[PDB]
C-alpha cells in the first residue's frame, strides 16, 4: 500500500491436496538446501576485514582492538562466533529477501552487539515518514525504528524491502514436490497404478457386493502385502497412472532442478545438475571468478554497504570501511601462484617480504 | 493519442480461465525472476564514480564531500543504501520500461534526495506542451512537472516513455503458465487424465444412476486418495489429456524458458539455461564482455546520460560526470593480470604506484 | 504511383480468424520485440561525435559548445535525453523503414531541436517536383516540406521512402501467432483435442437429446473443470487436433523464430537462438565484428549521411561532420588490449600519452 | 525478338489457385528479403571515392569540389543522400536484373543529377541501330535514349538487358508459398485435417439432411470455436490432409530457404539458415572474402564500369574513376591490425604517418 504493510508475501503457502507447500517443505528439497546452504556458507567463510583510510588513501588494516572490528570478526554476539552470525543472516538473506538484526550501541554510539531475529516474523511498515519494524514474538509485538535494526535487503522494488524469493518460488517447487510425491506414492505400491472392479453393469446390489472390494482394497492402500483377484471377464485396464516408462518423470525432475536453481542463482554445475559442465573445465580461476561475477557479489555487496552505512558512524565514511578478503575464493592453482609472484617480483609490483607475507612466512633480509 | 496519457500499456492483464496472468504470476516464472534478478542486482553492483574533468581533459575523481557523489554513493534517501536505490530503479527499468524517482533539491539546486516510486502507478501525459506525470496513491492522485521527477526511460517509441516488457511478455508468459499448470495438475492427480461413465445408451434414469458418478468422482477432482470402477463394457478411453510421454511436454518448456529469455535480453546460458554453453568456455574476460556489449552496457548508459542530463546542473555540463567502473566485471583471470601488469610496465605505460593502487597497495619509493 | 503517395504499407494487417495480426501483436513476439530491442539499444549506446576537419585533413573533435554536438549528444530536445531520442529514432527505422524528427532551426538557420514523430501516421506523397509529409493528428493533419523534416529511410525502392519490414513480415508472423495460440489453447484445455457425440444415426430427435451435451460440453470449451461422459457405443476419435507428440510443433517453432530474425537482419545465435554458435566461440572481436559488418553498419550510415546532408549546412560540408565511436563494440578481450597497445608502442605508431588518454589516465612527461 | 522489347520477363506471374504469386509475395518470404536487403544495403554502405591518375600513374583522390564526387558521394538528387540513391539502384538490380536511372547534365555535359526510375515499368527495345528506353508514367509513355538513361545490367544474355531474378525464381518461391499457406492452414484450425459424413449409402435425401452438415460445418471453415458430432457408424478417416508429423514440412522448407538462397548468391550461412557455418568459425577476414570474392564483387564492378563507361566523358578514361573502399568490409581482426601495421612499418613498405591516416590520428613528427 502506500501507508501500511510493505512487505509482501514473506513465506510459501500452497495446500496441492494432501501434501502442502510452506517453508520447510520447500527446504527439503534437495536443490533449494544446496543452493541456500552454499550462497551462506561461502559467504560467511570470507574473510571479513576493517581497514582505516588515511589523508593519503592508504588502508593499514586494523587490529581487534578496534570495536567494529572485533564486532565483525570475534564476537558479534555472547551465543555465537561471527561465522554463525553472517551465516544466520545471509541465509535469512537467501532463503527470504531480508536478514534483520537488533543493533545494541553503547553510549558513546558504537555498536556493541548485533542480535540476528527471525524473517518470516517481522513487518516492514510506513507509519508517516518513518519505518517502523514490527516484530512478532510469541504473545506480543515490537516495535522498532530504523535505528535499533541492521537490515539487509533483497533486490526487491520499492528499496525499502527484498522480495521473498521463497514465496515466488512457490509454484516450481509445487510442481517438484508433487512430481517427488507421485514418484514415492508408485514405488512404495509394487510399482504399479492401480484399478478395482467387483461389479459388471448391474450384476447384484444385495448378495456377495461388501467383502470381495475388501479382498481388492490391499492394492488400494496396501502398497505390497499382497491381494490378487480379478472378475473374470476382464478389464486390464489402469484407471490414475500412466507409466513412469515414457512420461520422462526424470527428465521432468531434472529440468525441475535447474527451473530452482534459476531462483537462487547458482549455476546447475554447481548445485550437482551435471548440466552445464561436463566434468571440470579449464577454471577454478575462471569458474570460481564467473560465479562470483554473477552469484556471490550481491550479496558481498550489500553486506559491505550495509555494514558502511548502517554500523558505521556518518563522521568516519572514508577512513573506516568493511571489506571481504576474496584470496581464498580466487586463490589460483598452485602452478599459476609461483608465476604471478615471479611476475610480480620482476616487474617491481612486488617486494619479496610482501609476497612472503602472503603465504605466512617471516620477513627476510633485503625483501 | 496527442494529447492523453502516453503511457501504453503497463501490466499484464491475463485470464487464461482460472488461472490469470499478472505481474506476480509472472514474476513467479524462474526464466523471469532470474532474468530481472541478474540484471538488477549486477546494474546495482556496480563502482558508480562522479568524476570532475579539468581544462586539460583530466578527470580527477572526486570524494563523498561531493553532495552528487554522496547522492550516489553513500545516502540517496534516509531509508535505503545507494545500491539499494539503484537496484530498485533498475528493477521497475527492467520490469517496465521505466523508473520514477521523486527528486528533493535544496535552494542551491543541488538534488538532495530522491525517493523512488513505483512504476505500475503512474502516467506519463502531455497537457499542452508540457510533461505530467499523475502518481496515483491510495486515494488521490499526485501530479508532478518534470523537474520533480528522475526518469530512466526504456526502448519504446515517442521517447517519452518506454515500453513495458511485461506487458509485451504477457503471451509467452501465459503459454508458460499454462504448461506449468498443467504439468502440476497431472501430476498431483496420480499422473492420469481421467475417464468416467456411468450409463450407457438410454440405459436407466430413474435407478442407480445418482450415487455410480460419486463413487467414480474421486479420479475427477479426487487427486489420488482412491476410487476404482468400472462398467462392465469397457471403455478404457482418455478425456481430456494426451500423455506427456510423447507431446514433448519438456521440449515445450525449455522452448519457452528460450523464449522468455529473449524478453530481457539474457543469454540462455546465463539464465542457467544448458541451451548455449557446453560447460564454462573460455570467456569470463570474453564471456563476460559479450554480456556487457549486448545486454548490460544499455542500463549503464541510460543512468549515466539521465544522471547528466537532469541531476547534473546545466552549468556543470562537463566538469562533472557519472561513470560506472567495469573493472570487476572484466577482471581477468588473475594469470592474465600478472601479464597484464607486465605489459603496462614494460612499455611504459604505467607506472608501479599506478598498477600498486589498482591492488589497492601502499606506494613504493620509485613507483 | 507516379504523383500519389509513395508509401506503401505501413502496419501489418490480418485477421487469421479471431486473433488479428497487427504491429503489437507481431511486437509481442519474443523474437521480433528482440531484434528490434537490440538493433535500437545498441545503436543509441554507441558514442556519437562532431568532427571539425581542417585544412589539413586533421579531425580535431569539438565540444558541446559547437550547436550541433550539443544537439546530438546532450538535448536533442526538452523532453528526453540524446540517448533515448536516438533509441525511439533507430527503432521506428528497424520496425518501419522510416523514421521521422520535426527539425526546428533559429533564424540563423543552425538546428536547435528535433522533435521525433510517429511513423505509421505519416504519409510520404510527391506533389509537384517536391515531396511533401503528411502527418495525421487526432483530427486536423499536417503538412510539411523537406526541410521542417529529418528523414532516415530504409532500403526500399525509389529512394523516397523505407520499405517497411512489419507490413512484408505479417504472414510469417501470422504463422507464429498461430502456432503459439494452437500450442497455448492445448495446454489450457487439460492438453487434448476434443471429441463430443450425443447421438447415433437417427435415434431420437425429441427425447432426451439437448442436455447431454450441455453435459459434454464442458470438455468444448471447459477447459480442465471436469466432464466425462460417454456414449456406450465408443468412437474415442479426435476432431479438430492432431497430437503435437510427432506434428514437430517445435521444429516449427524454431525454424519461424528463425524465419522471423531473417527480416531484421540479426544473426540467430544473437537472438538467443541456439542455432549458430556452440556455446560463445572465440569471438567478441570477431563476433562482434561480423555483426557490426553484416547487421549495425547500415543504420551508424544511414544515421551520419542523414545528418551531414540534412542537418549540417551546405557550406559546412567537410570541416563538419558526425561519426559514431565503435571502440566500445569492438574493444578487445582485455589481454589482446595490451599486446595491441605493446605493437603501436614499440613501432612508434602511438605515444605514451596517446595510449593513456585511451585509458582515461592523466599525461605522463614524456609521452 | 530482333528488332522489338528485349526485355523479357520482369515480374514474377503466378495464380496457385487462390494465393497468387507475385513481386510483393514473393518479397515477402524471410529468405528473399534477407537476401536482397542483405546485398543492397552492404553495397551502399562501402565507400566510394573518386580517383585522379596523374601521368605517372598516381591516384591522389579528390575532393567534393568534383561535380563527379560530390554527385556520387554527397547529393545525386534533392530527394536523398548518395547511400539511399545507391541502395535504391542495387535494389533494383538485385530483385529485378537491371536498374535505370534519368540522368541530367548541365550544358558542358557534366552529370548534374541521377533521378532512380521503377524497374518493372521500363521496356527496353531496338529501334533501327539503336536501343530505346520506353517508361511506363501513369498516363502516357515516356521514350529516352541511351545518353538519357544510365542503366546497371544483369548477367543476362544478348549483353543488352540483364534477366530478371524474380522472374526465375517463381516457381521455387511457389513452392515456397504453397508450403507456408498449407502450415498457416493447418495451425490455424485447431492442427488438424478435415473429415466429414452427413449421410450414408443411399439412406434419406428427403429429412434431417440439410442441417447436420451445418452442425459439422464449423470444422469445415472454423478453425477452432467447437463443433464435434460424428455419425454413429464412424468413419474417422481424413481427406485433405496428411499429417506434418512425418512429411518433413520442416525438412521441405529448410531446403527451400537453400532453393531460395540460391538464386541471390548469398551464402545459406549468412541468411541466418544454419546450414553451412556451426558456429562462427575462423574468418570475419577470410569469411568476408569469400563473399565478397563469390558474391559482392559482381555488384561493385557493375557500379565502378558503368560509372565510367557512362557518367565520366570520353576524354577523362584514365585521371578519372570511380573506385569502392572494401577496407571496412575486409577490416582486421583489431589484433592482426597491430601485426599488419608492425610488418608495413618494419619493412619499409609504410611511414608511420601513413598508417596513422588510416586510423585518422594526426601526423607525428618523423613519420
Known amino acids: 500500500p502506500n501507508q501500511g504493510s510493505q512487505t509482501g508475501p514473506v513465506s510459501a503457502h500452497g495446500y496441492l ?50 570495536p567494529l572490528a572485533r564486532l565483525l570478526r570475534y564476537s558479534p554476539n555472547q551465543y555465537m562466533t561471527a561465522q554463525e552470525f553472517r551465516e544466520a543472516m545471509t541465509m535469512q538473506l537467501c532463503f527470504y529477501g531480508n536478514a534483520y538484526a537488533l543493533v545494541d550501541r553503547n553510549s558513546a554510539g558504537d555498536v ?43 533486490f526487491g522494488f520499492t528499496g ?31 510399482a504399479k497404478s492401480p484399478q478395482i472392479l467387483s461389479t459388471g453393469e448391474k450384476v447384484l446390489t444385495e448378495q456377495q457386493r461388501s467383502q470381495v472390494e475388501e479382498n481388492f482394497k490391499e492394492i488400494a492402500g496396501g502398497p505390497v502385502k499382497k491381494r490378487l483377484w480379478i472378475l473374470e471377464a476382464g478389464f486390464s485396464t489402469s484407471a490414475i497412472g500412466v507409466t513412469p ?4 518423470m526424470m527428465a521432468s525432475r531434472k529440468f525441475q532442478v535447474s527451473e ?49 552505512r548502517w554500523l558505521i558512524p556518518s563522521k568516519d565514511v572514508g577512513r573506516l570501511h568493511a571489506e571481504h578478503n576474496l584470496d581464498g575464493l580466487l586463490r589460483g592453482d598452485s602452478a599459476s601462484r609461483a608465476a604471478f609472484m615471479k611476475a610480480m617480483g620482476e616487474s617491481g609490483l612486488r617486494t619479496i617480504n610482501e609476497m612472503r607475507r602472503t603465504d605466512n612466512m617471516p620477513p627476510l633480509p633485503g625483501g
Chains 1, 2, 3, 4 share one sequence.
Not at 538446501?33 to 556458507?41: A, E, K
Not at 548445485?271 to 562470483?292: A, H, P, Y
Request: net charge negative; with cysteine; hydrophobic share 40%.
Open 17 to 66: 491436496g494432501d501434501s502442502s507447500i510452506n517453508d520447510e517443505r520447500i527446504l527439503q528439497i534437495s536443490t533449494v538446501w544446496r543452493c541456500v546452504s552454499l550462497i551462506s556458507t561461502l559467504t560467511a567463510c570470507l574473510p571479513l576485514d576493517v581497514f582505516e583510510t588515511d589523508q593519503n588513501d592508504n588502508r593499514k588494516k586494523v587490529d581487534l582492538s578496534n
Open 245 to 248: 516408462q515414457d512420461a520422462e
Open 260 to 308: 530452482l536453481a534459476r531462483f537462487f542463482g547458482v549455476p546447475p554445475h554447481l548445485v550437482g545438475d551435471v548440466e552445464k559442465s561436463t566434468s571440470w573445465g579449464s577454471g577454478i580461476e575462471q569458474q570460481n571468478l564467473g560465479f562470483l561475477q554473477y552469484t556471490l557479489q550481491p550479496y558481498i555487496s550489500r553486506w559491505e554497504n550495509s555494514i558502511q
Open 112 to 154: 556493541i552487539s548485533l542480535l540476528p531475529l527471525q524473517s518470516a516474523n517481522m513487518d516492514v511498515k510506513l507509519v508517516g515518514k518513518k519505518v517502523v519494524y514490527r516484530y512478532q514474538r510469541d504473545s506480543e509485538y515490537a516495535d522498532f525504528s530504523q535505528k535499533e535494526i541492521f537490515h539487509l535487503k533483497g
Open 160 to 190: 525499502l524491502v527484498g522480495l521473498s524469493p521463497i514465496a515466488f518460488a512457490c509454484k516450481s517447487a509445487g510442481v517438484a514436490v508433487a512430481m517427488e510425491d507421485q514418484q514415492r506414492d508408485f514405488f512404495a505400491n509394487g
